[PDB]
Amino acid sequence: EVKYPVVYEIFIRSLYDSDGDGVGDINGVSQKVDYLRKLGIDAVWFMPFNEAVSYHGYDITDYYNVEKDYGTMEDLENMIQVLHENGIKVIMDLVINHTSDEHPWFKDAVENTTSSPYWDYYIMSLEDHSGQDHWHWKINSKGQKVWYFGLFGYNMPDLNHDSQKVREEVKKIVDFWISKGVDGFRIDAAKHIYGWSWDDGIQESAEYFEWFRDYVLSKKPDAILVGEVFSGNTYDLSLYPIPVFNFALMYSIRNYPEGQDGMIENNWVEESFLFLENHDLHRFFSHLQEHYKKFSESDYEFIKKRAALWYFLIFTLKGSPVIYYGGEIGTRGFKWHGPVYDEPVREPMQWYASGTGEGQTFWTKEVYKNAGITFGNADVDGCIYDDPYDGFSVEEQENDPKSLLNFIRFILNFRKDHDAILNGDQTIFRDWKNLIAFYRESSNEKLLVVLNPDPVWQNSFTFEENMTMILEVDFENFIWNESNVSFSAGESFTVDPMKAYIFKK
Amino acid sequence: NEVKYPVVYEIFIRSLYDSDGDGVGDINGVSQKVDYLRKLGIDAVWFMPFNEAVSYHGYDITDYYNVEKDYGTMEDLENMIQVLHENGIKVIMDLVINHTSDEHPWFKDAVENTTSSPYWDYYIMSLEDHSGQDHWHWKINSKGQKVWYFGLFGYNMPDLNHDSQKVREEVKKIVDFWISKGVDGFRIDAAKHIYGWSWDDGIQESAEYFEWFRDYVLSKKPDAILVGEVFSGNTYDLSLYPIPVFNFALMYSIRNYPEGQDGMIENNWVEESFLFLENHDLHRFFSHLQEHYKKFSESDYEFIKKRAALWYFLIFTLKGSPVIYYGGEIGTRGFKWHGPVYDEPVREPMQWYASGTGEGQTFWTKEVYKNAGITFGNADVDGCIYDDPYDGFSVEEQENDPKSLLNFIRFILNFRKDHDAILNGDQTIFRDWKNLIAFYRESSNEKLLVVLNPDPVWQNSFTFEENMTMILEVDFENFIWNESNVSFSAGESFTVDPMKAYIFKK
């Protein structure tokens, strides 16, 4: 009964360690269900929890088992039950573009070549493919050289989705996890299902998800589906027959954090999931710092205010908003380019003022130590982009009325009470740099949402019908209230710089 | 004998060539490397700021009328301009007039003497309280008055007040002065920000400002080169300016779609804009491509080289002045950092030698990296995070290697010199597909058809609208090129394979 649930993206390894090895785990997730519920989220998307070679989980070796680092199948079933009991759905990261090169299917294809049932699961050859783009090779025990295609590299051989066996195997994976209680799927690398290069075959990849959608919805009509199509082009995003993450809006906001004429209409993708950061990007807070060249601590409050304003927008626009774990406390982080790469935007969630306490994950500390990184005291406290006592923690923000955490909790709690946002259509009313205004309307409620992201210039509009102000936000003073004020059709309303309002019919 | 679209080489003096041994690239060093520049096929050099300034990059100026001492003397500069001129190379000065250093004597006087200072009107200053207002800063003078001032880029970069006619007169005077030194044109820093109370405020007002600036400069020197740095990927914003600007839209589009995209040329077109693939504020293009493909291994260098080469080919044949950032021609690597260093790693010592060391090699970064505790890439030892000894990335290793990026670029630039249609011609789009970029260049003296297929997989084809002769073929996948002529007739069909380019002549 909620068309546009709020999604929380969790990296299990960095959330909560329930047994002391420093690694976030599945029982750890269950132990933080109260925090999730109070945050106001409707669903969790987990980064991959299948058995996999690498820490991030995107190179899978068993689709039907749980990564041992995270726990057991029993743990997973229990956690799904706990989240459900708390009104929270579970979205599974489905990684079917490729497997690990350590997947038993692939190992068998390498060993037994054309005699292997899995030879046709992949894109393989015994003919020399040296020098060809994205082709790799292994030598099996018989000394034979086996060539295979792998867009993402030698350790991620591509699956052959022209094989009906592979399609049946995808159906079995879907069936299996639906039987465990999973509520939907986030489909990894949805851009690349087909294509002989990075930007080849988006039409064929989109077409693939017609059969996939039909199958999943046949088994579970209310299933959540979202594809990761890593493109900022609205045409590419709109091609897909399933919802996708709206990278266009995300990039637009990052490029124009003080607004831009036409921002909403120009980056609109119907039914898309709205977000500001994820496990593949610089953290949004850090991006804003870089944008403003404001890297010092006296600029934190300045940055917080701009961040909050764009969260407000994706929480009120039509579509499902996605919060990346820790985004709600302003978690910082930049991708690196060696000797570590995406670890620093996937760091331990900061529960504690001091950076340490019960359940605190710290798996990164050994990673950073072995890599020789001491910047940010990373090799001792585990985080390049967080320090003890710096205000970035759940503990420090929890009872602070001006924290980003409590703003987000406030808006998400507000959101639950308004069917026009949860289920409604949308009609853009204004789409200017300093005046974003849109109606949300379901059969039960009609709202007008307005926001001025410009730090300098006010704007105004005339009411089209009688409405009541039910929310006011002042991002510059960082205060908000729900005092009701009536307005009449024909009345002019001024929207000051960095304010937002919601009016109700 | 005019060239409307000269090839520009962007030089960071500190990182090019050290002529006196302190490890700091200097102006005499530039003169000593004039043969390399001429032979590369460069028509003009744009120098990062060489005025007296606080920081290593030069963008916080304390004297518009003197040369930074790290780089040399005014006499050095005059001789260097002479040397480049004698070699057919023009000189473009980085003109930084949005702001000065807070250590500029004008600003110091304004703070100290307030409304009695001749320079009070030069800045955006006030004795009224501005606490809490964004981009407002203050200093307290010797009389204990708190002086407030606007500084978009920060407290140490107070904005000049361009609504003041005194500041307009000062700008005229700076321009006149450097013109009298033989400077051939100006790259205008932060042209997006001349006006505006915030980062994205006042672009129209800033564009309007350059009408009077252009009119004044051209009145003094009709053939002056002008290009504004407007840091925006929006073609409408870029096209608003009455002077040429760097085409950030095309650069971002190529970086986002390095295997082509429908409408690439037309959707990112900015008339008279300067074309480029990297600069001193961006990740190096070679490194960008590595990240894009997740190909950071040395076994992938060849693969990356080929892609880099085809986009250089494009910006060397499209209408506009192409700009090469120093070391781009050997595929120099580099990522911006976010602490303890920032843009230093994309502004590292030019790699002249296979070994990393040799006469004139700059190494000013070695101390920077040592003091910041950076040992990655052995940087505290050889001064480069993003270069190693004997790794193939140097002028020495590439200069006589037939398949090097340097030899390809040098080849195309010297080819370019012989074709008036590129140097001076108009442009007419013929095809604008992901796997078929094709456009005419035509001057009164020559007509060309340029064709490129950046798609690594899918061929395409077109039909000739008139008889033309193929005068260049480039195979990027095999990394070979040739100028053996082949005639073609109107109505004849031509197939453009993946990763190939052609130039046909009427």
Ligand SMILES: [Ca+2]
């Ligand atoms: Ca902290």
Ligand SMILES: [Ca+2]
């Ligand atoms: Ca080298």
Ligand SMILES: [K+]
């Ligand atoms: K992934």
Ligand SMILES: [K+]
């Ligand atoms: K600059």
Ligand code: NA
């Ligand atoms: Na654990």
Ligand code: NA
């Ligand atoms: Na694809």
Ligand code: NA
């Ligand atoms: Na694929």
Ligand code: NA
């Ligand atoms: Na830290």
Ligand code: NA
């Ligand atoms: Na020197």
Ligand code: NA
């Ligand atoms: Na501006």
Ligand code: NA
């Ligand atoms: Na300014």
Ligand code: NA
């Ligand atoms: Na090095």
